[PDB]
Amino acid sequence: EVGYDDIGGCRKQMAQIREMVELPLRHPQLFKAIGIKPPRGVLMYGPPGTGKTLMARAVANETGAFFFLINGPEVMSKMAGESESNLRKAFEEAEKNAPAIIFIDEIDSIAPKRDKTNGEVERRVVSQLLTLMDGMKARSNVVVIAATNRPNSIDPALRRFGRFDREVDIGIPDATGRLEVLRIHTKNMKLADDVDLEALAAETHGYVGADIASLCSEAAMQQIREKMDLDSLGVTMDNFRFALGNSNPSALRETVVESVNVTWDDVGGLDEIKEELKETVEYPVLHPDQYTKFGLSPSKGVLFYGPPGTGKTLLAKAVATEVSANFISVKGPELLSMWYGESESNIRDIFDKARAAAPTVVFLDELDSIAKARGGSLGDAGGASDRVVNQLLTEMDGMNAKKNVFVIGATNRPDQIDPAILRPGRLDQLIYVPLPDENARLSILNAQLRKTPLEPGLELTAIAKATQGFSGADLLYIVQRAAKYAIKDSIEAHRVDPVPYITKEHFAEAMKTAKRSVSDAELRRYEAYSQ
Amino acid sequence: EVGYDDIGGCRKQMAQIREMVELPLRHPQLFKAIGIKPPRGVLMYGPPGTGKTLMARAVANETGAFFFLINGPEVMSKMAGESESNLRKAFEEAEKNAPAIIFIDEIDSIAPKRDKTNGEVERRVVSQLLTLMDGMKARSNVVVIAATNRPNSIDPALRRFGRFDREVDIGIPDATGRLEVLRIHTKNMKLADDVDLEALAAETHGYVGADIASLCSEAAMQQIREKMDLIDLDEDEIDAEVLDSLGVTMDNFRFALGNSNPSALRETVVESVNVTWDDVGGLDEIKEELKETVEYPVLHPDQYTKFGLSPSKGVLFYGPPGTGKTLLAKAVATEVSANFISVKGPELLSMWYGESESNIRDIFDKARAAAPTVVFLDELDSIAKARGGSLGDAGGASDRVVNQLLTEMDGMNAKKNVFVIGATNRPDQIDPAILRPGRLDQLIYVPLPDENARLSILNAQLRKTPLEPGLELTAIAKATQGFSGADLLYIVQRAAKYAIKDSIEAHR
Amino acid sequence: EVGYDDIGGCRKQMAQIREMVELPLRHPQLFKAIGIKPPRGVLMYGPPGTGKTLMARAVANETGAFFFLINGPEVMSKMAGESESNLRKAFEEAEKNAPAIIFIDEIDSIAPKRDKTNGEVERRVVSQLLTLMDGMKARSNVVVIAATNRPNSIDPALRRFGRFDREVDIGIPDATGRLEVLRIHTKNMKLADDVDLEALAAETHGYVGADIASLCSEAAMQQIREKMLGVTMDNFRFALGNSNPSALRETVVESVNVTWDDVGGLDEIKEELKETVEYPVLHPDQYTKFGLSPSKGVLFYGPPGTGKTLLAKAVATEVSANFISVKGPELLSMWYGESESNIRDIFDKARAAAPTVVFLDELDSIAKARGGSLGDAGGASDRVVNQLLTEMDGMNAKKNV
Amino acid sequence: QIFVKTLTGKTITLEVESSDTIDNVKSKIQDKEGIPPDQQRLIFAGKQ
Ligand SMILES: Nc1ncnc2c1ncn2[C@@H]1O[C@H](COP(=O)(O)OP(=O)(O)O)[C@@H](O)[C@H]1O
Ligand SMILES: Nc1ncnc2c1ncn2[C@@H]1O[C@H](COP(=O)(O)OP(=O)(O)O)[C@@H](O)[C@H]1O
Ligand SMILES: Nc1ncnc2c1ncn2[C@@H]1O[C@H](COP(=O)(O)OP(=O)(O)O)[C@@H](O)[C@H]1O
Ligand SMILES: Nc1ncnc2c1ncn2[C@@H]1O[C@H](COP(=O)(O)OP(=O)(O)O)[C@@H](O)[C@H]1O
Ligand SMILES: Nc1ncnc2c1ncn2[C@@H]1O[C@H](COP(=O)(O)OP(=O)(O)O)[C@@H](O)[C@H]1O
Ligand SMILES: Nc1ncnc2c1ncn2[C@@H]1O[C@H](COP(=O)(O)OP(=O)(O)O)[C@@H](O)[C@H]1O
Ligand code: BEF
Ligand code: BEF
Ligand code: BEF
Ligand code: BEF
């Protein structure tokens, strides 16, 4: 069995359902002494994976009343009048032994909106449920509850005072709301003494009711896998970090990202940009009590508008594996559709899912194709293309709560972005990444390679003082051409070097074919702002 | 029994339903010598639990007759033709004990339209009820009662002459009708000497009657939950001096007034962000002009009737982005007594054919079921698109969804004091038929704040702050010339971000 | 019957699915007194043609336990009911007589997303599939196994811990996973020893296991049609011609003549193209020895009539990588949502080849440098250039494209 | 530049009803069908 101590998380939502299915049954002398009769059951809803389908298991044992289970599509049969007679013979079955409770699991299947359907038995099974809850006289002491995940596809007459009183929301847990979650999913298990449950709750954001229950299962499965080489075992927070790699995506399974990482040391030169991007995402997560003490919302939106080649479109790849936050990647116009429809909903279902996995860091790459709103229709650009921006303007600020959603934008043309997005609240941190100078390029050449013997005795400072006016990935071409000539002097008959010893002779012809990508005329369009 | 006293309000519609159930039964010789008896059928439509399922329970106890009840799809069974026979023997059961009174409930499964069904037994049950309702013509017959929502989905053959020609609407109580609801529902309860029953009905404006019973239930539970001293769990009796009654105070009804959540907009609940009319500081003449045009038709609806003029409704917001005009709509979310409905641009647009125009027709009906309310349309450029020059660029009839919004702003009926608020940054791409006083009266323009306005802007954001020894904010106002309201939020956020950074560096 | 040796050809994803259903049965005493229930639902996905319909039959002989099997749309019959009860008849029969293994197939057609379809049967099939996987203390004996190629089309509430977790990715086997497929369906065939089999492991790369079984079946029909006995290389070399992997069947290119001798004079250009696509394919260990990423391809520009549509024809017939030709602005379309996914699935098939090379002729038409600075033409179609901008380097990792 | 919404329709289901009962075929097995033109049925007796 399970009890009320075996369910953690929403303690405030636990008490409002405990005073309604137990307190009118255990304490019946308050309602007849003062006040109206006790009301009927509530409609549980929320995101999938929370404990809406395991809360009703606790009230089936400790209450002691007669429990009847009615699933959603279980009361269904091909006859004309047994799809509703099986529904009404179970509610009167609970009336034989008062008091009794009835759980309607997945009420969205057998109760849609009646105006959307036409010519089915499903408009009859909902009208049977109308006269079954609050009929003429057939309601004495039974309390019927339900659980679903889509409260919008329910008929509004079913959420009236007679049938469903309150819409209790089992929501996403927070800090010290997901800490007692891991304590009860680790009570019966044999654990060691080096495990710290408080540190695991801080690095789990989208883990709500079952992904955090997947974390105690995958770490225990890894402990079984290493023990295959009677005997007692125990986790030691090594498999917990191994299970922390892929255990988040319940809601964000459609937008997973894998698996490139630069581990914060493959980039160089941008020492001020690396610290500015770090404290904009670590401050609302690591110290959330400092912002509530000051009473001010933090800054979220950052935008990159540098010239092509400096390191903006994979600086988001640096924060995708370093900070402890959910990462959502949008590669250009990868969400557009042609249906007068889903192209607008693709922004809508990507933000509330990100708001459900709060906190998170989303990434919008190449916003030149997204933010074309102020010109339309420009002959062949196509009309009705400004609605994809106005939906984006209602998700960054809109009318919503602050869910610590950080928006990272990377683009190469700063003049083709909508200036309605260019405002605080949506995109306030406007940083311009320049070309590397002679100081940044020496920290760029050694940080790019990081894994190769470099013929100790050479000097990379001569390359940094030379090849001026070059981008960061322009220097990637030089070390790739030098490695191209290094293996060109090694693929011959070895019967030559049995060592990856790249020398200066491979760097001689690499500087000959090294060309500048960003022209001088294209450079002045970025220096024309000077804000 | 429920009797005459249990029905709350609805007095103009109670007098219609009394004369067709009492006077043929009380005075059967009155209808003689003046012709035949007109009323033999009735249909109550509207919202379902506003007093239509209670009216059938009312006449079962205040009109003594051989009464029985007909549910929804309970006449269906796994037989051959028994579905059209058990309701035939139900009507014959009412006539063999004549005089009697008959009530049928929820005729959506019993009598749908004949063009929606396709070759099943459901199209014969509506034909069976159509024949037996008017063919049964004896003396002192039974009178049928139908209490069903969605009256437009009924077959028009059920209203010819004799099935029912006396259909009535149980209307929504707007003013001084919900007070008669609260006098009856709190009569069985022993109220404490703190509540004001006139103030509970005058603050809110749109209920359905059934949610008024939802107001007193949550107010009764919060007084018990506040006085929940649980010391003796096994003895489970809360007295603390004597067997007594706790009652309910005025503060318990104010808590239930916060999370009211009426049934008309239960699927359109807004995120309750706290506002106290002080998050905006720079706007001092456009904020109070906004409050007087949304309170005067709803707080005092007597001066507009005395003058005989139409109330003012409809306001558009336009200007540069970053200075209010959508977060002013945040200020009227929880502060005004009217309910709020938010639209985040093309969030109600759908991909189906007739669903995009139907998702805009019913939110206005949810605004119509909820008596006077305010709605909000953010980024009207995503909706309008100037109604000119499609040329295939619209594609999926993007100018035809606008024409549904043409007829809903001015309305074909009388207006029920609804308020539409549009917010955008560009007034040139809006169609000029939106800018007419039948739909949007005035077009107010929020300007960029000057030095006198932006000084009180920084005072608005620095409300709940653990401040340092104070510095002058007029020097920051005279230096930040020509910035929007959101631009000054960035400066106080950057100054606060440096206040978090040195605090961690001070620790260890 | 098939078994664990007949399914051999994957190693890392094989041990994840084997210990999920055999280790709680061969050794049940270690889960007991451990506090955690075993995982209860397998969901294997990947590209089509891999052994997601033949993995379930493979451990549907070696465990020696009570196998079952449900097809995709045969459970959907026209009754008001019984589309959910035939699902119940397949689970309540599988409840008794522990242990239990049940395999459900085609979960992409049936059980779709809830708010993305409009059909009243589809609202009841999704939740009856949920309720039998977690009801009122359900999931006590059965272990469900799913198999699909579209994991994004299924319901988002279906991939929870209680019903479908520890999902395993069955990808394209090329790093010594392709060679293990050859040694399975050739030990039953008669092979005359005249060649080695290790040279065939690097000839084509877009083969997904099922295309390898079509490669050895093409050599079987070529062997019997010339003897009109064993097998030889000449049937396999004829099978190496018109190879046509299943992921690249929509775009064919093998229709040109023999090349690499029709060009001359630009030998430093001909050797340069050999230095950029043959080096990581033939010597992959030298790039990881230096620890650097390989170089990208070659852009051609010059006078018309020089040979730059012949240099594309030279690499299409000589190198071992796959070739995808784009006939100018071929992928540009009239639809708004298309010409963004139409440029995406070419690059999605390019990363699924691992490796390959694609060709984009007349880059003036597909780039159209910046529509923001373009006002005299009036095009302003910057969507097709930005999606191309984030598909080559982009956000995803490299797979030697 | 071109947009189309959709068209709707498709999936519908049906219900089926049952035949008569248990006890009609209990009485349908105990009756007679008739004499085709002219036959006899039974005229016998036993045990002395
Ligand atoms: N208090 C809780 N906190 C977190 N997860 C919980 C809690 N109680 C149960 N669960 C998890 O919920 C799952 C069972 O219920 P669930 O699937 O969430 O039901 P439903 O989907 O119907 O709401 C299991 O994975 C269980 O570990
Ligand atoms: N010094 C460098 N710093 C960062 N990225 C570099 C550097 N040298 C080469 N690169 C690589 O070059 C590519 C360009 O990065 P970025 O400037 O963000 O994109 P873009 O090429 O679109 O301007 C990335 O893959 C990046 O890792
Ligand atoms: N006069 C009244 N004013 C307001 N609410 C009422 C009144 N009479 C009954 N109710 C409420 O209506 C509910 C019962 O009838 P209801 O559910 O409204 O019926 P129906 O939905 O069939 O119209 C109860 O919540 C009751 O408190
Ligand atoms: N003086 C002010 N008046 C109103 N809002 C202000 C003021 N100072 C700062 N703000 C804040 O700045 C933000 C501006 O948002 P808003 O102007 O509604 O957005 P938009 O630019 O999309 O119209 C809001 O969060 C608002 O509370
Ligand atoms: N390990 C394997 N490597 C390559 N091909 C395999 C392997 N196992 C089975 N196959 C092939 O897969 C086919 C049967 O399964 P398949 O059709 O791939 O299933 P599904 O399409 O459901 O994933 C046969 O052609 C068989 O030869
Ligand atoms: N010397 C040559 N080298 C390469 N191609 C040649 C040569 N002489 C003729 N051709 C042929 O002429 C055509 C032009 O080749 P290419 O320069 O690539 O295209 P284009 O004519 O568009 O410039 C091809 O069919 C090519 O095979
Ligand atoms: F099982 Be739960 F309703 F997602
Ligand atoms: F009277 Be209600 F429609 F059940
Ligand atoms: F929300 Be505002 F209209 F940008
Ligand atoms: F290839 Be499928 F799994 F049948």
Side-chain angles (χ1 to χ4, degrees), chain A residues 375-383 385, chain B residues 391 393, chain C residues 332-334 336 374-375 377-383, chain D residues 1-2:
Chain A
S377 198
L378 200 46
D380 269 356
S385 159
Chain B
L391 306 180
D393 294 82
Chain C
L332 190 43
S333 53
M334 47 202 277
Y336 173 77
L374 180 143
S381 65
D382 295 18
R383 269 78 181 252
Chain D
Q1 72 179 3
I2 184 56

PDB file of all heavy atoms in Angstrom, chain A residues 375-383 385, chain B residues 391 393, chain C residues 332-334 336 374-375 377-383, chain D residues 1-2:
ATOM      1  N   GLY A 375       8.273  44.750 -42.669  1.00  0.00           N
ATOM      2  CA  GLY A 375       8.064  44.842 -44.099  1.00  0.00           C
ATOM      3  C   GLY A 375       7.235  43.688 -44.618  1.00  0.00           C
ATOM      4  O   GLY A 375       7.693  42.541 -44.630  1.00  0.00           O
ATOM      5  N   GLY A 376       6.010  43.976 -45.050  1.00  0.00           N
ATOM      6  CA  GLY A 376       5.126  42.940 -45.544  1.00  0.00           C
ATOM      7  C   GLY A 376       3.809  43.481 -46.069  1.00  0.00           C
ATOM      8  O   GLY A 376       3.182  44.311 -45.403  1.00  0.00           O
ATOM      9  N   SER A 377       3.370  43.035 -47.247  1.00  0.00           N
ATOM     10  CA  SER A 377       4.104  42.080 -48.077  1.00  0.00           C
ATOM     11  C   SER A 377       5.016  42.806 -49.060  1.00  0.00           C
ATOM     12  O   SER A 377       4.580  43.702 -49.782  1.00  0.00           O
ATOM     13  CB  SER A 377       3.135  41.167 -48.831  1.00  0.00           C
ATOM     14  OG  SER A 377       3.792  40.004 -49.304  1.00  0.00           O
ATOM     15  N   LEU A 378       6.288  42.412 -49.081  1.00  0.00           N
ATOM     16  CA  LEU A 378       7.287  43.055 -49.935  1.00  0.00           C
ATOM     17  C   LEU A 378       7.410  42.310 -51.267  1.00  0.00           C
ATOM     18  O   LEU A 378       8.457  41.781 -51.633  1.00  0.00           O
ATOM     19  CB  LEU A 378       8.626  43.133 -49.208  1.00  0.00           C
ATOM     20  CG  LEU A 378       9.664  44.155 -49.689  1.00  0.00           C
ATOM     21  CD1 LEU A 378       9.025  45.515 -49.936  1.00  0.00           C
ATOM     22  CD2 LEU A 378      10.811  44.267 -48.696  1.00  0.00           C
ATOM     23  N   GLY A 379       6.293  42.260 -51.990  1.00  0.00           N
ATOM     24  CA  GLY A 379       6.266  41.679 -53.318  1.00  0.00           C
ATOM     25  C   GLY A 379       6.319  40.164 -53.344  1.00  0.00           C
ATOM     26  O   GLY A 379       5.330  39.508 -53.682  1.00  0.00           O
ATOM     27  N   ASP A 380       7.473  39.597 -52.990  1.00  0.00           N
ATOM     28  CA  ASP A 380       7.659  38.153 -52.967  1.00  0.00           C
ATOM     29  C   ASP A 380       8.038  37.622 -51.594  1.00  0.00           C
ATOM     30  O   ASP A 380       8.313  36.422 -51.466  1.00  0.00           O
ATOM     31  CB  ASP A 380       8.726  37.735 -53.989  1.00  0.00           C
ATOM     32  CG  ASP A 380       8.140  37.421 -55.351  1.00  0.00           C
ATOM     33  OD1 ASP A 380       6.899  37.460 -55.489  1.00  0.00           O
ATOM     34  OD2 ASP A 380       8.920  37.135 -56.284  1.00  0.00           O
ATOM     35  N   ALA A 381       8.071  38.475 -50.566  1.00  0.00           N
ATOM     36  CA  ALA A 381       8.402  38.006 -49.224  1.00  0.00           C
ATOM     37  C   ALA A 381       7.260  37.210 -48.608  1.00  0.00           C
ATOM     38  O   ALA A 381       7.495  36.366 -47.736  1.00  0.00           O
ATOM     39  CB  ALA A 381       8.765  39.189 -48.329  1.00  0.00           C
ATOM     40  N   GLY A 382       6.028  37.459 -49.044  1.00  0.00           N
ATOM     41  CA  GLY A 382       4.887  36.729 -48.531  1.00  0.00           C
ATOM     42  C   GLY A 382       4.217  37.415 -47.361  1.00  0.00           C
ATOM     43  O   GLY A 382       4.859  37.699 -46.345  1.00  0.00           O
ATOM     44  N   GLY A 383       2.923  37.686 -47.493  1.00  0.00           N
ATOM     45  CA  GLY A 383       2.171  38.289 -46.414  1.00  0.00           C
ATOM     46  C   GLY A 383       1.858  37.298 -45.311  1.00  0.00           C
ATOM     47  O   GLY A 383       2.153  36.104 -45.399  1.00  0.00           O
ATOM     48  N   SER A 385       3.315  37.128 -42.519  1.00  0.00           N
ATOM     49  CA  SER A 385       4.552  36.664 -41.914  1.00  0.00           C
ATOM     50  C   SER A 385       4.972  37.502 -40.716  1.00  0.00           C
ATOM     51  O   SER A 385       6.044  37.259 -40.153  1.00  0.00           O
ATOM     52  CB  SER A 385       5.682  36.654 -42.952  1.00  0.00           C
ATOM     53  OG  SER A 385       6.953  36.672 -42.326  1.00  0.00           O
TER      54      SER A 385
ATOM     55  N   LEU B 391      -4.185  38.968 -52.498  1.00  0.00           N
ATOM     56  CA  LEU B 391      -3.424  38.544 -53.687  1.00  0.00           C
ATOM     57  C   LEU B 391      -2.701  37.211 -53.483  1.00  0.00           C
ATOM     58  O   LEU B 391      -1.617  36.988 -54.028  1.00  0.00           O
ATOM     59  CB  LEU B 391      -2.435  39.627 -54.132  1.00  0.00           C
ATOM     60  CG  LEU B 391      -3.013  41.023 -54.368  1.00  0.00           C
ATOM     61  CD1 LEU B 391      -1.922  41.985 -54.808  1.00  0.00           C
ATOM     62  CD2 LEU B 391      -4.134  40.972 -55.394  1.00  0.00           C
ATOM     63  N   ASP B 393      -1.324  36.240 -50.732  1.00  0.00           N
ATOM     64  CA  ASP B 393      -0.457  36.323 -49.563  1.00  0.00           C
ATOM     65  C   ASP B 393      -1.193  35.975 -48.276  1.00  0.00           C
ATOM     66  O   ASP B 393      -0.564  35.491 -47.329  1.00  0.00           O
ATOM     67  CB  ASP B 393       0.151  37.721 -49.452  1.00  0.00           C
ATOM     68  CG  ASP B 393       1.096  38.038 -50.594  1.00  0.00           C
ATOM     69  OD1 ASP B 393       0.610  38.422 -51.679  1.00  0.00           O
ATOM     70  OD2 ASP B 393       2.322  37.906 -50.405  1.00  0.00           O
TER      71      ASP B 393
ATOM     72  N   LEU C 332      13.586  24.310 -53.958  1.00  0.00           N
ATOM     73  CA  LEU C 332      12.754  25.471 -53.682  1.00  0.00           C
ATOM     74  C   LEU C 332      11.321  25.207 -54.131  1.00  0.00           C
ATOM     75  O   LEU C 332      11.081  24.699 -55.230  1.00  0.00           O
ATOM     76  CB  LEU C 332      13.321  26.702 -54.389  1.00  0.00           C
ATOM     77  CG  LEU C 332      12.736  28.073 -54.050  1.00  0.00           C
ATOM     78  CD1 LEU C 332      12.532  28.234 -52.553  1.00  0.00           C
ATOM     79  CD2 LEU C 332      13.656  29.156 -54.576  1.00  0.00           C
ATOM     80  N   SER C 333      10.364  25.555 -53.272  1.00  0.00           N
ATOM     81  CA  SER C 333       8.967  25.230 -53.517  1.00  0.00           C
ATOM     82  C   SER C 333       8.096  26.447 -53.243  1.00  0.00           C
ATOM     83  O   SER C 333       8.575  27.483 -52.776  1.00  0.00           O
ATOM     84  CB  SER C 333       8.512  24.048 -52.656  1.00  0.00           C
ATOM     85  OG  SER C 333       8.801  24.281 -51.290  1.00  0.00           O
ATOM     86  N   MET C 334       6.801  26.304 -53.543  1.00  0.00           N
ATOM     87  CA  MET C 334       5.877  27.426 -53.413  1.00  0.00           C
ATOM     88  C   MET C 334       5.322  27.537 -52.000  1.00  0.00           C
ATOM     89  O   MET C 334       4.869  28.611 -51.586  1.00  0.00           O
ATOM     90  CB  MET C 334       4.737  27.282 -54.422  1.00  0.00           C
ATOM     91  CG  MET C 334       4.123  25.894 -54.467  1.00  0.00           C
ATOM     92  SD  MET C 334       3.264  25.562 -56.016  1.00  0.00           S
ATOM     93  CE  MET C 334       1.675  26.317 -55.689  1.00  0.00           C
ATOM     94  N   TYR C 336       4.923  27.777 -47.933  1.00  0.00           N
ATOM     95  CA  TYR C 336       5.624  28.584 -46.940  1.00  0.00           C
ATOM     96  C   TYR C 336       6.409  27.707 -45.974  1.00  0.00           C
ATOM     97  O   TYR C 336       7.580  27.976 -45.683  1.00  0.00           O
ATOM     98  CB  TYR C 336       4.624  29.464 -46.188  1.00  0.00           C
ATOM     99  CG  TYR C 336       5.208  30.218 -45.013  1.00  0.00           C
ATOM    100  CD1 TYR C 336       5.986  31.351 -45.210  1.00  0.00           C
ATOM    101  CD2 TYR C 336       4.973  29.801 -43.707  1.00  0.00           C
ATOM    102  CE1 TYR C 336       6.518  32.046 -44.139  1.00  0.00           C
ATOM    103  CE2 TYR C 336       5.502  30.487 -42.631  1.00  0.00           C
ATOM    104  CZ  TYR C 336       6.272  31.609 -42.853  1.00  0.00           C
ATOM    105  OH  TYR C 336       6.800  32.296 -41.783  1.00  0.00           O
ATOM    106  N   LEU C 374      18.631  43.776 -50.257  1.00  0.00           N
ATOM    107  CA  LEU C 374      18.037  43.559 -51.572  1.00  0.00           C
ATOM    108  C   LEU C 374      16.643  44.178 -51.585  1.00  0.00           C
ATOM    109  O   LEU C 374      15.731  43.686 -50.913  1.00  0.00           O
ATOM    110  CB  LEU C 374      18.010  42.064 -51.887  1.00  0.00           C
ATOM    111  CG  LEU C 374      17.454  41.484 -53.184  1.00  0.00           C
ATOM    112  CD1 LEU C 374      18.302  40.309 -53.621  1.00  0.00           C
ATOM    113  CD2 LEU C 374      16.031  41.010 -52.938  1.00  0.00           C
ATOM    114  N   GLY C 375      16.482  45.258 -52.344  1.00  0.00           N
ATOM    115  CA  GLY C 375      15.197  45.919 -52.443  1.00  0.00           C
ATOM    116  C   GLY C 375      14.735  46.102 -53.874  1.00  0.00           C
ATOM    117  O   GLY C 375      13.550  46.344 -54.126  1.00  0.00           O
ATOM    118  N   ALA C 377      15.094  43.707 -56.329  1.00  0.00           N
ATOM    119  CA  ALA C 377      14.464  42.476 -56.801  1.00  0.00           C
ATOM    120  C   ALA C 377      13.121  42.231 -56.128  1.00  0.00           C
ATOM    121  O   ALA C 377      12.181  41.755 -56.776  1.00  0.00           O
ATOM    122  CB  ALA C 377      15.388  41.280 -56.563  1.00  0.00           C
ATOM    123  N   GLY C 378      13.012  42.540 -54.839  1.00  0.00           N
ATOM    124  CA  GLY C 378      11.768  42.324 -54.132  1.00  0.00           C
ATOM    125  C   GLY C 378      11.530  40.903 -53.683  1.00  0.00           C
ATOM    126  O   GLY C 378      10.388  40.541 -53.397  1.00  0.00           O
ATOM    127  N   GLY C 379      12.572  40.080 -53.621  1.00  0.00           N
ATOM    128  CA  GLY C 379      12.416  38.712 -53.168  1.00  0.00           C
ATOM    129  C   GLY C 379      12.236  38.607 -51.668  1.00  0.00           C
ATOM    130  O   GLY C 379      11.171  38.186 -51.200  1.00  0.00           O
ATOM    131  N   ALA C 380      13.286  38.988 -50.923  1.00  0.00           N
ATOM    132  CA  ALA C 380      13.320  39.003 -49.452  1.00  0.00           C
ATOM    133  C   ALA C 380      13.009  37.631 -48.852  1.00  0.00           C
ATOM    134  O   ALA C 380      12.350  37.522 -47.816  1.00  0.00           O
ATOM    135  CB  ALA C 380      12.391  40.076 -48.878  1.00  0.00           C
ATOM    136  N   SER C 381      13.483  36.577 -49.511  1.00  0.00           N
ATOM    137  CA  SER C 381      13.304  35.211 -49.020  1.00  0.00           C
ATOM    138  C   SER C 381      14.563  34.771 -48.277  1.00  0.00           C
ATOM    139  O   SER C 381      15.368  33.969 -48.752  1.00  0.00           O
ATOM    140  CB  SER C 381      12.973  34.272 -50.177  1.00  0.00           C
ATOM    141  OG  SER C 381      14.055  34.185 -51.087  1.00  0.00           O
ATOM    142  N   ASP C 382      14.721  35.325 -47.076  1.00  0.00           N
ATOM    143  CA  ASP C 382      15.878  35.032 -46.240  1.00  0.00           C
ATOM    144  C   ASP C 382      15.702  33.775 -45.401  1.00  0.00           C
ATOM    145  O   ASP C 382      16.590  33.450 -44.607  1.00  0.00           O
ATOM    146  CB  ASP C 382      16.180  36.222 -45.327  1.00  0.00           C
ATOM    147  CG  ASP C 382      16.600  37.445 -46.104  1.00  0.00           C
ATOM    148  OD1 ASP C 382      16.322  37.478 -47.319  1.00  0.00           O
ATOM    149  OD2 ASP C 382      17.202  38.363 -45.509  1.00  0.00           O
ATOM    150  N   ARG C 383      14.583  33.068 -45.555  1.00  0.00           N
ATOM    151  CA  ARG C 383      14.384  31.832 -44.812  1.00  0.00           C
ATOM    152  C   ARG C 383      15.227  30.699 -45.386  1.00  0.00           C
ATOM    153  O   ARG C 383      15.800  29.910 -44.627  1.00  0.00           O
ATOM    154  CB  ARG C 383      12.900  31.455 -44.811  1.00  0.00           C
ATOM    155  CG  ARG C 383      12.101  32.004 -43.630  1.00  0.00           C
ATOM    156  CD  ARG C 383      11.760  33.481 -43.808  1.00  0.00           C
ATOM    157  NE  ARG C 383      11.007  34.019 -42.679  1.00  0.00           N
ATOM    158  CZ  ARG C 383       9.716  34.332 -42.723  1.00  0.00           C
ATOM    159  NH1 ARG C 383       9.032  34.167 -43.846  1.00  0.00           N
ATOM    160  NH2 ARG C 383       9.112  34.816 -41.647  1.00  0.00           N
TER     161      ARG C 383
ATOM    162  N   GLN D   1       4.494  31.183 -49.870  1.00  0.00           N
ATOM    163  CA  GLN D   1       3.593  32.329 -49.892  1.00  0.00           C
ATOM    164  C   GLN D   1       2.136  31.878 -49.876  1.00  0.00           C
ATOM    165  O   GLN D   1       1.228  32.688 -49.691  1.00  0.00           O
ATOM    166  CB  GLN D   1       3.848  33.192 -51.129  1.00  0.00           C
ATOM    167  CG  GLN D   1       3.375  32.548 -52.422  1.00  0.00           C
ATOM    168  CD  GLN D   1       3.613  33.417 -53.637  1.00  0.00           C
ATOM    169  OE1 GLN D   1       4.186  34.502 -53.540  1.00  0.00           O
ATOM    170  NE2 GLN D   1       3.158  32.949 -54.792  1.00  0.00           N
ATOM    171  N   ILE D   2       1.922  30.578 -50.069  1.00  0.00           N
ATOM    172  CA  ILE D   2       0.577  30.027 -50.252  1.00  0.00           C
ATOM    173  C   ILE D   2       0.206  29.339 -48.937  1.00  0.00           C
ATOM    174  O   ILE D   2       1.043  28.744 -48.254  1.00  0.00           O
ATOM    175  CB  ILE D   2       0.506  29.097 -51.469  1.00  0.00           C
ATOM    176  CG1 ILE D   2      -0.919  28.590 -51.727  1.00  0.00           C
ATOM    177  CG2 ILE D   2       1.518  27.954 -51.369  1.00  0.00           C
ATOM    178  CD1 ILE D   2      -1.940  29.696 -51.892  1.00  0.00           C
TER     179      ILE D   2
END
